Amino acid sequence: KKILIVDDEKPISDIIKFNMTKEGYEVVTAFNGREALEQFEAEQPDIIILDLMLPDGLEVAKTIRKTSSVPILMLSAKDSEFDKVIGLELGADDYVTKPFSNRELQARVKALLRRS
Amino acid sequence: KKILIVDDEKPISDIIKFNMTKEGYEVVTAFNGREALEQFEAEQPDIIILDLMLPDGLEVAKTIRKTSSVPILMLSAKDSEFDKVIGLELGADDYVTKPFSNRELQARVKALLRRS
Numbered sequence: 569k570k571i572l573i574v575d576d577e578k579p580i581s582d583i584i585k586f587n588m589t590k591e592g593y594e595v596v597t598a599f600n601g602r603e604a605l606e607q608f609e610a611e612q613p614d615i616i617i618l619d620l621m622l623p624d625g626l627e628v629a630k631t632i633r634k635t636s637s638v639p640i641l642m643l644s645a646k647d648s649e650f651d652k653v654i655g656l657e658l659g660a661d662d663y664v665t666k667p668f669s670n671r672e673l674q675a676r677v678k679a680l681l682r683r684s
Numbered sequence: 685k686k687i688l689i690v691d692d693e694k695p696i697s698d699i700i701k702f703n704m705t706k707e708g709y710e711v712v713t714a715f716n717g718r719e720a721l722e723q724f725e726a727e728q729p730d731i732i733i734l735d736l737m738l739p740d741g742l743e744v745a746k747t748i749r750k751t752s753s754v755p756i757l758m759l760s761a762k763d764s765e766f767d768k769v770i771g772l773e774l775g776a777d778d779y780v781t782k783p784f785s786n787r788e789l790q791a792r793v794k795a796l797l798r799r800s
């Protein structure tokens with residue numbers, strides 16, 4: 569399976585990339601909203617891990633949902649009700665906060681792919 | 685023309701109703717998100733003035749846009765960039781803050797109907 573990690577912090581992007589590669593996923597990366605959209609169209613990932621804050625995540629997920637039902641897992645340091653709810657309502661299938669557990673992230677990615 | 689005013693404060697709802705009636709609009713009212721949706725479907729207004737905070741406005745406008753291009757003018761006490769931008773991106777044609785000028789509200793309603 570192919571995962572697109574949309575994350576503007578190269579340290580976090582590398583941790584997720586390393587862990588998904590170890591699990592046997594193919595990884596493509598993007599570091600802003602424009603790159604996320606280009607990678608999305610060109611690579612057709614099976615799942616996207618999308619941070620909410622990008623050079624926004626809300627906007628990327630909105631435009632994606634115009635054409636695609638690809639599962640989106642939103643990742644963010646923002647952990648209030650309002651953040652989670654508006655990520656889910658704007659199309660996220662799931663919303664995990666940072667810092668996260670590597671094993672939980674993996675379990676939640678598999679649960680998204682299982683249902684999809 | 686028919687205006688649906690979705691506002692959960694009966695004092696503000698009455699000020700807008702009074703002013704739109706004086707301008708020759710037919711007015712229907714709704715005081716929460718559920719009533720807004722019911723009035724929308726049953727009354728088919730030409731325009732909707734939608735407050736953002738309801739017993740949300742963001743959710744109402746989202747679901748409306750699933751089926752309809754009816755012009756939406758968002759009205760709110762929240763006046764930050766983030767509020768305006770996410771109201772517009774979630775489908776509002778316009779975003780006016782409270783307190784507002786009665787004459788400006790009227791001018792902006794007419795400008796929405798002119799283009800539509």
Ligand SMILES: [Xe]
Pocket residue numbers: 626627630770773774
């Ligand atoms: Xe958005």
Ligand SMILES: [Xe]
Pocket residue numbers: 654657658742743746
């Ligand atoms: Xe929403």
